[PDB]
């Protein structure tokens, strides 16, 4: 399944710019980001230690639209794979087909990328993969199905991807509307506002 609902509440609860909306407008002009959602948005009160980890957990979950059962397995696979459980974590859900397409800019938001990918409109390595959770590898080419080449949504989002921060680890050819995954990004390549150490500590409870 997937979360369907208002998106500012997800950002308003935490107070961070969750990329659930296209970069057409800044979030403050769309929603009251300075208050948590609900009737009691103007209160105060320090969060407990466990609450901070859980809020950190749901930020990674809500940004990529992942449920924890996959995340727990993604944690398990990250705990499985050698190296730090910290950076093994973010790479696992950064290689999702929907997230990769979002990095390619074919969708203004991961919600667009998920629907666009799930609608068989994306073929990676020439074969149509209609699942959001496919794990792409290094050197994999991700393209849009030829019947879906004239979609204005990718046409609009590709330009919107320009004013969002050009991601280095993947390159996109505008004319072919196809991109290749060079290699999995490291910690420096992702935003530092996350605290992946809060991810590991919470799941040890």
């Amino acid at each position: 399944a997937r979360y369907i609902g208002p998106k500012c509440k997800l950002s308003r609860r935490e107070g961070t710019d969750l990329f659930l909306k296209s970069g057409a407008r800044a979030l403050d002009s769309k929603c009251k980001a300075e208050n948590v959602p609900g009737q009691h948005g103007q209160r105060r009160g320090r969060l407990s230690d466990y609450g901070l980890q859980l809020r950190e957990k749901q930020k990674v979950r809500r940004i990529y639209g992942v449920l924890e059962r996959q995340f727990r397995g993604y944690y398990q696979e990250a705990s499985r794979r050698k190296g730090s459980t910290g950076e093994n974590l973010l790479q696992l859900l950064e290689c999702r087909l929907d997230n990769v397409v979002y990095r390619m800019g074919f969708g203004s938001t991961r919600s667009e990328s998920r629907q666009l990918v799930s609608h068989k409109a994306i073929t990676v390595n020439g074969q149509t993969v209609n699942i959001p959770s496919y794990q792409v590898k290094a050197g994999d080419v991700v393209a849009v199905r030829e019947k879906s080449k004239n979609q204005l949504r990718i046409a609009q989002a590709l330009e919107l991807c320009g004013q969002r921060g050009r991601v280095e680890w993947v390159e996109v050819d505008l004319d072919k509307k196809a991109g290749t995954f060079k290699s999995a990004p490291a910690r420096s390549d992702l935003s530092a506002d996350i605290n992946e150490n809060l991810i590991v500590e919470l799941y040890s409870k």
Binding site: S84, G86, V200, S204
Partner: peptide
């Protein structure tokens, strides 16, 4: 090893 968080009680954490 590198990666695992602070696995300790909240008093000493």
């Amino acid at each position: 090893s590198e990666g695992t968080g602070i696995i300790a009680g909240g008093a000493m954490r």
